[PDB]
Design a protein that fits this description.
The complex is a heterodimer. By secondary structure, chain A is of the alpha+beta class. Chain A has helices at 4-32, 71-84; strands spanning 49-52, 62-66, 145-150, 165-170, 182-185, 211-216, 225-232, 250-256. Chain A has one domain (1-257). Chain A contains two helices and eight strands. In chain A, the strands form two sheets. Chain A has a four-stranded antiparallel sheet. By secondary structure, chain B is α+β, with helices and mostly antiparallel strands. Chain B folds into four domains: 1-39 and 119-238, Calcium-transporting ATPase, cytoplasmic transduction domain A; 56-109 and 239-332 and 718-977, Up-down Bundle (Calcium-transporting ATPase, transmembrane domain); 333-345 and 557-717, HAD superfamily/HAD-like (Rossmann fold), CATH 3.40.50; 346-556, Calcium-transporting ATPase, cytoplasmic domain N. Helices cover 45% and strands 15% of the residues of chain B. Chain B has 36 helices and 28 strands. In chain B, strands 10, 11, 14, 15, 16, 17, 18, 19 and 20 form a nine-stranded mixed sheet that branches. Chain B is elongated. Chains A and B meet through helix 1 of A and helix 29, strand 28 and helix 32 of B. Bound molecules: 1,2-dioleoyl-SN-glycero-3-phosphocholine (2 copies), O-dodecanyl octaethylene glycol (CE1) (2 copies), the ligand CNCc1cc(-c2ccccc2F)n(S(=O)(=O)c2cccnc2)c1 and 2-acetamido-2-deoxy-beta-D-glucopyranose (NAG) (3 copies). Chain B: It comes from Sus scrofa. Chain B: Its EC number is 7.2.2.19. Chain B: The active site is at residue 338.
Chain lengths: 257, 977
């Protein structure tokens, strides 16, 4: 009659108790945890590299378009617009003109509302590939602009000597033509060292990764080609057979006419 | 249809079979008759192909649950290579793994049954039997299998009866029908039709039986399958082998599993679709859940445990034909047991003597391990002289290593019994006999009905003759006039005849065959050396002799049998005799072995002592009961149930093959699990219908052995008690090994339940769930087989099959939703620790799966804003695998320890005392570490070298399990209420 209640109430008792025990495990774990620095960075050995505008195929990044058909590239450009809508002077007020040119170590929290200073990085620094004077970021010409962005890992330092460069070159350079000529923006193709080291989203709520534009100039039309686009910095490795995005980005590209 | 032959005239038999009753079959005509009917033997069981004997191992309750599982897995995997580009194919792995254990187990079962039936077949001493046939008027020897119907054959003492023989003429021909009937004493065979039922006539001799003494000739009436032997065997075709109690139990918990898998899968399909998933994926998780309740290694481990118990019994000369049988004796509540050749040795041996006015008691055991009798007296030395000298039996040559009770003897039945008796009291009887040259002898006849012989003495200083004679006790008594007693040779006055007659009837009352012995030394005056005695002239005394004593014989229990019966009853198992033999012998042995306890009595005994009619006896007072087949024929099944319920110690005498099967059935139907033990063809039918059929390896008929599930290779009836013990351990221990194996299935599933309903990154992978199920926890769960008992196991009643199951709903509920629960909160705490210490806080983790698994995000942001590539997120997912796995392993050290005992605390019985279990915890941790810290392992098996905080996060949860089960077990222990 009334004993299924006396056992089921044992189960609701047992699961409430056990749940609470788990809760206190979480709570106590959430004080192990520093809000500004992750305990271990075990898989972020070297930074990931991402490209933009990213279009993916069966085998990975696969960008393909037709200079004469804006349908096939408006979208591409419109991603580069949306991507850079957060590099506008408008949405860069929370950061400051770093000019230091070497690492921007901060040990205390001297920025508004108990935070740290993050550097400004504005679209117009990509110059020709900034979406002005060309709102198609070089696609309508056949000399497209690919934005390269290095993944941020907290307190990661790329290298003391130079700034990290982006070298971007053919995988198999066509055997009736020359190497890939690229123009980078900024000019050597570098991420300036005052953007490193990243302290975290809580620390620098307004941070924005340095971008480098790669304007590909002499890609032969109507041919399948693959561009490797790796990062040269001392603490940055790009030869990992189980992450092909550690330290680089490969992409296949065909520009049709 | 067989009945025609023993009722025909010799003219009619010669007509029917185109034969002569004295000159026999023509030669060519018997060549043709052989072409017609085939050889004279029983055509073996049809014989199923090798590939199908493999096929049938892949079938069974767990097995079919696993085939349905892999069925579901392949239906789902097809749905999923249709539903976008998924190269996940976990269901390929799981389904193919299920097929894998089902199959590999299959090989193991097939190979076990192979090796076991080679072990049984290789003690079967197939030596071709022969027969004295007469053809064209010639007596010669042919193989028994070449006898065609209508042949004229001859038998003498020693010969095996070659076919089914209808007897035309016989001189004092007695026979051993114990393989067909129950009867332990020799059965007369004479040519006159004594019954219309050919089983109960005396003018047929049966295909498989032994001619013990005398001589007969008769015509062949059936060969091969058509003989009463092949007919009673063919009865055991029409008996269907019901399924074992262990098979029932397995199917019970397969049903519990199935219930759970449906109830869950359904509940989370409702939930899955209320979370806005597509019906087409909510069916995929329905499927994954349903399959997730099917353990992957269970079938493997139980098929290992049964196999280890089989090895134990095989070590004790108890070969089992298939693994399920190692359990059955533990669940048995009654033993329907054959008498002659089973409980007894089927060998008439001297059991008692009457001499110096006392009934002495000889040691009837086969290993000679009991109380012999007093051999001081002059009377005994004389009585030994008479029974040793008046005897014509002789051991076959070169038997000196053979123990005497097992030696082959060229003699009659009584004479064989007595010859072994002299060889075990006097020592070297035949040489002794040689030392007293026989000068005259009348052998047993139908005129005199006694055997006598006259001998010259041993030394030369006594030159007398000694006349020794033996025969039926009354017939010996009237022929003699004094009695040896205590060095006196007193006159045989009225009181000695009354006391002799009292002893004779007492040994007849215990169902023994009594023989009287006597002597007379002959004068030198009247009978001087070289005197020509003449048996026809009778020129010597056959009267006025001197009585020595009585010697009496019986078919006696096997040495270890009385004790074996004792222990089975100590362990709550009802023993029932079911014997074809006559009630008086049946009841004697049922006393001797402990079936009928010292001091209980039948209703006929109560009437006989109280001096009342049996109508007045209160049946409730009679703890024992004997019922022959005749009364059992005129019994409603309700009367049989009244008798079985009313009279604890039941003996069925004169019981046909079918009646044994019917007593088995009546118990079974009353709820019993029934074991039957049996010698021969008659008990073969009961053997098949039994929950477990036990055949005697040596004494046993091919029919019996074939029906039986288990063979006592050395006829040691005490093996039975070992069977009870090993089937009570391996049951309790399986209840342990299963409880362990089932408990990992909830921590293996709650990750996927959460990963669906919360969209957390995947805590635990398929590729690693397989390692748990088939690698890390196998050796622990098998080690539980080696647990010793937690009680005086052989003093416990047999389990109630309807109440106490292998897996109850309480047992499951406990192992799944309490110990499994604690394991899942263990793993999930180690999961959220492993992620927060790497960058991902819990609140971020809800909903994060779409982005987690997206190949088109190589910059997904953690809680510190750092940006992971998909590959990096994947190596984190493997770390999540490995910590959830290790949480499960630590909690399965706690599991294997608390599942050592169901009642007792670990402090009492121990921790390190099961040594195989300890080796298996070391093994489990070693495989764990090899999977974590070997190089290459993140890529080959998706296992990360986890940090050493991740091992310890489960420790409190493990110890919590230990303490929780202790408190429960102490609750049961120190409070039955
Ligand atoms: C039928 C049986 C069902 C049993 C299900 C389990 C129910 C119990 C589960 C959750 C209840 C809430 C537990 C968490 C709250 C703990 C107390 C608390 O207040 O802690 C604060 C945290 C942190 O706060 P923050 O991250 O915003 O700040 C970061 C803090 N700083 C900046 C200092 C680092 O709050 C948080 O994270 C909130 C996290 C809430 C989401 C947790 C993830 C949900 C996963 C559940 C899986 C459970 C497995 C169940 C196994 C059952 C086996 C049968
Ligand atoms: C109790 C005894 C039972 C009898 C044994 C039966 C065991 C059979 C169990 C499973 C068989 C199925 C596996 C066979 C298929 C191999 C396929 C292969 O080509 O493999 C490579 C994979 C690595 O895939 P990935 O995840 O890196 O790819 C990711 C791909 N992307 C990126 C597209 C997602 O590896 C794998 O799947 C392999 C996964 C295999 C998991 C094994 C589970 C542990 C079993 C242990 C039994 C050990 C017996 C030893 C006996 C010795 C006696 C002398
Ligand atoms: C339920 C919450 C559990 C919280 C777990 C706290 C883990 C604390 C780990 C301390 C380990 C020491 O620091 C790690 C670095 O070791 C360096 C030496 O190697
Ligand atoms: C709510 C229950 C939570 C229970 C958790 C309690 C234990 C928490 C652990 C913290 C205790 C502090 O001691 C740290 C123990 O770590 C000692 C291990 O040292 C060995 C070195 O570790 C190196 C990492 O492994 C090698 C691979 O990684 C590189
Ligand atoms: C039988 N008990 C062990 C078990 C087996 C699976 C499983 C189910 C479907 C397909 C493949 C699987 F390995 N699961 S599972 O909880 O459903 C699960 C866990 C993690 C990833 N996928 C599913 C649990
Ligand atoms: C940012 O600071 C630099 C440092 O030299 C200065 O030249 C430049 O005018 C500033 N840009 C602004 C305020 O837009
Ligand atoms: C960038 O654009 C300007 C024209 O506005 C031109 O002066 C300069 O040469 C361009 N650089 C490249 C590499 O095209
Ligand atoms: C796109 O280029 C193709 C050559 O591949 C050309 O035929 C076509 O006209 C172009 N598209 C349009 C819309 O003209």
């Amino acid at each position: 009659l009334s004993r299924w209640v006396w056992i089921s109430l044992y189960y609701v008792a047992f699961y409430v108790v056990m749940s609470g025990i788990f809760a206190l495990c979480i709570y106590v774990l959430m004080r192990t945890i520093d809000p500004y620095t992750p305990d271990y960075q075990d898989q972020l050995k070297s930074p990931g590299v991402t490209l933009r505008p990213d279009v993916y195929g069966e085998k990975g990044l696969d960008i393909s378009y037709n200079v004469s058909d804006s349908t096939t590239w408006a979208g591409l450009a419109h991603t580069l617009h949306r991507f850079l809508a957060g590099y506008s002077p408008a949405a860069q007020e929370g950061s400051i003109n770093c000019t230091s040119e070497k690492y921007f170590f901060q040990e205390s929290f001297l920025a508004p509302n108990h935070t740290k200073f993050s550097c400004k990085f504005t679209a117009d620094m990509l110059q020709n590939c900034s979406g002005r004077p060309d709102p198609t970021f070089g696609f309508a010409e056949g000399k497209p602009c690919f934005i390269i962005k290095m993944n941020r890992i907290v307190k990661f330092l790329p290298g003391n000597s130079t700034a990290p460069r982006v070298d971007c070159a053919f995988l198999d350079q066509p055997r009736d033509g020359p190497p890939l000529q690229v123009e980078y923006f900024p000019a050597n193709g570098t991420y300036s060292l005052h953007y490193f080291p990243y302290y975290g989203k809580k620390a620098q709520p307004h941070y924005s990764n340095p971008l480098v534009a790669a304007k590909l100039l002499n890609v032969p039309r109507n041919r399948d080609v693959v561009i490797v686009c790796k990062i040269l910095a001392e603490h940055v490795s790009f030869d990992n057979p189980h992450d092909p995005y550690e330290g680089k980005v490969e992409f296949k590209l065909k520009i049709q006419k | 249809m067989e009945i025609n032959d023993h009722q025909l005239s010799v003219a009619e038999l010669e007509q029917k079979y185109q034969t002569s009753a004295t000159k026999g079959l023509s030669a060519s005509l018997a060549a043709e008759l052989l072409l017609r009917d085939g050889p004279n033997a029983l055509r073996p069981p049809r014989g199923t192909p090798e590939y199908v004997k493999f096929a049938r191992q892949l079938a069974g309750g767990l097995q079919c649950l696993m085939w349905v599982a892999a069925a579901i897995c392949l239906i789902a995997f097809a749905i999923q290579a249709s539903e976008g580009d998924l190269t996940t194919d976990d269901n390929l792995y799981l389904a193919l793994a299920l097929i894998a254990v089902v199959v590999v187990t299959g090989c193991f079962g097939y190979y076990q049954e192979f090796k076991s039936t080679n072990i049984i077949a290789s003690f079967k001493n197939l030596v071709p039997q022969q027969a004295t046939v007469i053809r064209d008027g010639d007596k010669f020897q042919i193989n028994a299998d070449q006898l065609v119907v209508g042949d004229l054959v001859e038998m003498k003492g020693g010969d095996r009866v070659p076919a089914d023989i209808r007897i035309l003429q016989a001189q004092g021909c007695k026979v051993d029908n114990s393989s067909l009937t129950g009867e332990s004493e020799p059965q007369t065979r004479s040519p006159e039709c004594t019954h219309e039922s050919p089983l109960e006539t005396r003018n047929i001799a049966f295909f498989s039986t032994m001619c013990l003494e005398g001589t007969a000739q008769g015509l062949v009436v059936n060969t091969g399958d058509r003989t009463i032997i092949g007919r009673i065997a063919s009865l055991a075709s029409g008996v269907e082998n019901e399924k074992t109690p262990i098979a029932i139990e397995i199917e019970h918990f397969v049903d519990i599993i199935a219930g759970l898998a449906i109830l869950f899968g359904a509940t989370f399909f409702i939930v899955a679709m209320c979370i806005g998933y597509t019906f087409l994926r909510a069916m995929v998780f329905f499927m994954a859940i349903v399959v997730a309740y099917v353990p992957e290694g269970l079938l493997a481990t139980v098929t290992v445990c049964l196999s280890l118990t089989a090895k134990r019994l095989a070590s004790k000369n108890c070969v089992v034909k298939n693994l399920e049988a190692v359990e059955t004796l533990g669940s048995t509540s009654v033993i329907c047991s054959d008498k002659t050749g089973t409980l007894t040795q089927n060998r008439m041996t001297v059991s008692h003597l009457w001499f110096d006015n006392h009934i002495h008691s000889a040691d009837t055991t086969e290993d000679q391990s009991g109380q012999t009798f007093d051999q001081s007296s002059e009377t005994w030395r004389a009585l030994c002289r008479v029974l040793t000298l008046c005897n014509r039996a002789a051991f076959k040559s070169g038997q000196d290593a053979v123990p005497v009770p097992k030696r082959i003897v060229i003699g009659d039945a009584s004479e064989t019994a007595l010859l072994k008796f002299s060889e075990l009291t006097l020592g070297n009887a035949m040489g002794y006999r040689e030392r007293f040259p026989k000068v005259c002898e009348i052998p047993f006849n139908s005129t005199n009905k006694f055997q006598l012989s006259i001998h010259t003495l041993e030394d030369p200083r006594d030159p007398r003759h000694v006349l020794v004679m033996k025969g039926a006790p009354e017939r010996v008594l009237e022929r003699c006039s004094s009695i040896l007693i205590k060095g006196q040779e007193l006159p045989l006055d009225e009181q000695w005849r009354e006391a002799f007659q009292t002893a004779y009837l007492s040994l007849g009352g215990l169902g023994e065959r009594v023989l009287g012995f006597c002597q007379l030394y002959l004068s030198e005056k009247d009978y001087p050396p070289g005197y020509a005695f003449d048996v026809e002239a009778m020129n010597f005394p056959t009267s006025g002799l001197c009585f020595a004593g009585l010697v009496s014989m019986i078919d006696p229990p096997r040495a270890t049998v009385p004790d074996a019966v004792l222990k089975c009853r100590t362990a709550g198992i009802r023993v029932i005799m079911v014997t074809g033999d006559h009630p008086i012998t049946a009841k004697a042995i049922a006393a001797s072995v402990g079936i009928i306890s010292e001091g209980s009595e039948t209703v006929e005994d109560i009437a006989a002592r109280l001096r009342v009619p049996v109508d007045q006896v209160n049946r409730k007072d009679a703890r024992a009961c004997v019922i022959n087949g005749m009364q059992l024929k005129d019994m409603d099944p309700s009367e049989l149930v009244e008798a079985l319920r009313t009279h604890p110690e039941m003996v069925f005498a004169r019981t046909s093959p079918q009646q044994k099967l019917v007593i088995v059935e009546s118990c079974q139907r009353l709820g019993a699990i029934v074991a039957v033990t049996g010698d021969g063809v008659n008990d073969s039918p009961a053997l098949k219908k039994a929950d477990i059929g036990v055949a005697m390896g040596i004494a046993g008929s091919d029919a019996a052995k074939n029906a039986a599930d288990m063979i006592l290779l050395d006829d040691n009836f005490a093996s039975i008690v070992t069977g009870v013990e090993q089937g009570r351990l391996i049951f309790d221990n399986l209840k342990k090994s299963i409880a362990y194996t089932l408990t990992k299935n909830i921590p293996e599933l709650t990750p996927y339940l959460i990963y669906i309903t919360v969209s957390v990154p995947l805590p635990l992978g398929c590729i690693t769930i397989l390692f748990i199920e088939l690698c890390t926890d196998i050796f622990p769960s098998v080690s539980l087989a080696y647990e010793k008992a937690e009680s005086d196991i052989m003093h416990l009643r047999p389990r109630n099959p309807k109440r106490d199951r292998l897996v109850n709903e309480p047992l499951a509920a406990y192992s799944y939703f309490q110990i499994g629960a604690i394991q899942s909160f263990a793993g999930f705490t180690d999961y959220f620790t492993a992620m927060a210490q790497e960058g991902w806080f819990p609140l971020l983790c809800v909903g994060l799966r779409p982005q987690w698994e997206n190949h088109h995000l190589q910059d997904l942001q953690d809680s510190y804003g750092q940006e992971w590539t998909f590959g990096q997120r994947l190596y984190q997912q493997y770390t999540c695998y490995t910590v959830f796995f290790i949480s499960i392993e630590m909690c399965q050290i706690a599991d294997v320890l608390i599942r050592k005992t169901r009642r007792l605390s670990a402090f009492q019985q121990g921790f390190f005392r099961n040594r195989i279990l300890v080796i298996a915890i070391v093994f489990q941790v070693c495989i764990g570490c090899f999977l974590c810290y070997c190089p290459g392992m993140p890529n080959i098996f998706n296992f990360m070298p986890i940090r050493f905080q991740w091992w310890l996060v489960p420790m409190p949860f493990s110890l919590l399990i230990f303490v929780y089960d202790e408190i429960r077990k102490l609750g049961v222990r120190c409070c039955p209420g």
